[PDB]
Amino acid sequence: PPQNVTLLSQNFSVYLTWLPGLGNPQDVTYFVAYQSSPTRRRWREVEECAGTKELLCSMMCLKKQDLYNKFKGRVRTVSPSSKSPWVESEYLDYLFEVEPAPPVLVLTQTEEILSANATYQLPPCMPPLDLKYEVAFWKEGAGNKTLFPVTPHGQPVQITLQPAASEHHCLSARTIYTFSVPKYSKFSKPTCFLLE
Amino acid sequence: APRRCLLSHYRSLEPRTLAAAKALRDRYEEEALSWGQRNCSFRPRRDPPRPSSCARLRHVARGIADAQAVLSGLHRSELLPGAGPILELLAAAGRDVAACLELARADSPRCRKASVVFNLLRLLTWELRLAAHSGPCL
Amino acid sequence: MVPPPENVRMNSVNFKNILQWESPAFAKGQLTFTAQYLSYRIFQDKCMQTTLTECDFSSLSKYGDHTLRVRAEFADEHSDWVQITFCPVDDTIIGPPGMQVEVLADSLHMRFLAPKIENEYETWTMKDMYNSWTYNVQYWKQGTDEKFQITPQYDFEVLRNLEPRTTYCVQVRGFLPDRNKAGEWSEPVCEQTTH
Ligand SMILES: *[C@@H]1O[C@H](CO)[C@@H](O[C@@H]2O[C@H](CO)[C@@H](O[C@@H]3O[C@H](CO)[C@@H](O)[C@H](O)[C@@H]3O)[C@H](O)[C@H]2NC(C)=O)[C@H](O)[C@H]1NC(C)=O
Ligand SMILES: *[C@@H]1O[C@H](CO)[C@@H](O[C@@H]2O[C@H](CO)[C@@H](O)[C@H](O)[C@H]2NC(C)=O)[C@H](O)[C@H]1NC(C)=O
């Protein structure tokens, strides 16, 4: 049986992960099934993870998952000799526990205007939610980070380009998810680039 | 004077209202778990959506009315508190949706109550957002 | 015999509800006030035996109308209820949005910050509350007072071709196109363009 079955969320996605116990052979596969908080009797089995040696299986896009309601997952170790009993996981509510990720900043520059439009890779089918992003802009040696006011997804953060020498300006963004409580993400890797 | 359609501000609900709805659903779940499982099935079955605007407004109005009735009846018995904000927002949304609609032109009750309580979050966040994007009937 | 309160109003800016009233012409002694709000067909005493002539009602939900009702009391004796109705989503007013103006050469860059609701987080502003939201701007050369109106589609606006060494004063406000309800013109900020 997998010892640590844990259902967590990373980058707008829901992952069920587990590590197994010692003594099992090296030919064990894994069967995974998910259960919603309502109608707990149902134990729908995840096909993409069915009989997969992978120790991680995505949960965001399944046969029928109501991200609004809570859901949990169970895993089992399947071997030709025998199958271990299922090991369940603690409940997870998506819209109240989804972990956001920083966006990709598409940098478009004008003669005096710089745009930091944020692009996100959201799961194909997820509930729409606030995706305001904070943009941090600085110089290669300044250290102090200029934080711009949050802007909604689909709105480029606009930075005035004061004329100066060509310097290596760096940029980053952070996702703020405020469905019911603001959930801030982490600042992305700086996109350091020369500016004339 | 007839009331204008002001559905545009329901696209993003107040965070505290959604937190209250979450707490209410958690309390209902705790009540269901404490007394044991219910024989009647209360699966939050998917509701088939349609691209029609006025039909969508009518359906969200029906959902608002049913949820308001169930939650108000439950609150009368004081089984679970904290339904105040939810009830007043349900009344306001139903009033606005009905105003827009008019201006433009043997299952046990327990499983029904469970179903509407579970689908309250989806109705507040998904169906209401689509209704707000829809506006008045074309 | 106790005179009722006069000139009761509900001042609500950015959903900051404060019910105010004018104290009456009581002969002498102390005249306290008691204010309640209707909820579930029974009035709940928001303020009891308060010396102040106003009380805040921001605790009440921004959704749905309310009935406010305040009287004056003289020790055991009492006065008649003075009552108003208040719809926060419609009777509130939008405060002046914050302005970030930077002038370079003959170009003035404008960044608008939505007014914030005191009971919510900094992320949920009045712009989130009124989703169908727009920013209006009026600018004029100092003294000329010819209101030129520009309505940016986003929170940024770039005015161009400004005659050098002449100050331009600008103001911003929050407009709601669907209902045709303007907010409050922000403080008129005057910028002198660089030579
Ligand atoms: C900045 O990045 C945002 C990223 O969202 C861009 O907004 C996106 O623009 C595309 C069009 O280029 C939109 O796609 C369209 O979506 C509609 C459904 O709403 C669909 O029917 C169309 O066929 C098309 O696929 C997309 O929805 C839109 N997303 C958002 C969140 O607004 C934006 O264009 C970029 N540039 C600027 C200047 O903002
Ligand atoms: C995975 O599960 C095992 C077993 O439940 C955990 O092992 C325990 O870890 C705690 C950490 O403080 C120790 O105090 C216990 O002595 C460990 N053994 C038991 C039997 O509880 C382990 O922490 C879990 N996580 C990981 C990453 O291995």
Residue numbers in the entry:
A (entry chain B): 6 to 201
B (entry chain C): 23 to 127, 147 to 179
C (entry chain A): 20 to 214
Task: List sentences from the manuscript.
When they were initially discovered, type III interferons (IFNλ1-3) were structurally and evolutionarily classified as members of the IL-10 superfamily of cytokines.
A The structure of the IFNλ4 (red) ternary complex elucidates the mechanism of IFNλR1 (gray) and IL10Rβ-A3 (gold) engagement. IFNλ4 engages IFNλR1 with higher surface area and has fewer polar contacts with IL10Rβ. While the overall topology of this interface is similar between IFNλR1 and the IFNλs, these chains find themselves in closer proximity to IFNλR1 on IFNλ4, leading to a 38% higher buried surface area (BSA) at the IFNλ4:IFNλR1 interface (1740.7 Å2) compared to IFNλ3:IFNλR1 (1260.1 Å2). Ultimately this leads to an affinity of 191 nM between IFNλ4 and IFNλR1 as measured by surface plasmon resonance (SPR), more than 4-fold higher affinity than the previously published 850 nM interaction between IFNλ3 and IFNλR127. There is the same observed “pinch” on Helix A of IFNλ4 formed by Tyr140 and Trp143 as with IFNλ3-H11, with Tyr140 forming a hydrogen bond with Arg38 on IFNλ4 and Trp143 forming a hydrogen bond with the backbone oxygen of Leu35. Comparison of the structures highlights differences in receptor engagement and reveals a distinct 12-degree rotation in overall receptor geometry, providing a potential mechanistic explanation for differences in cell signaling, downstream gene induction, and antiviral activities. While this region of the protein is uninvolved in receptor engagement, molecular modeling reveals that this highly basic region of IFNλ4 containing the amino acid sequence KRRHKPRR is predicted to lack secondary structure unlike the corresponding region of IFNλ3, breaking from the structural symmetry of the two proteins.
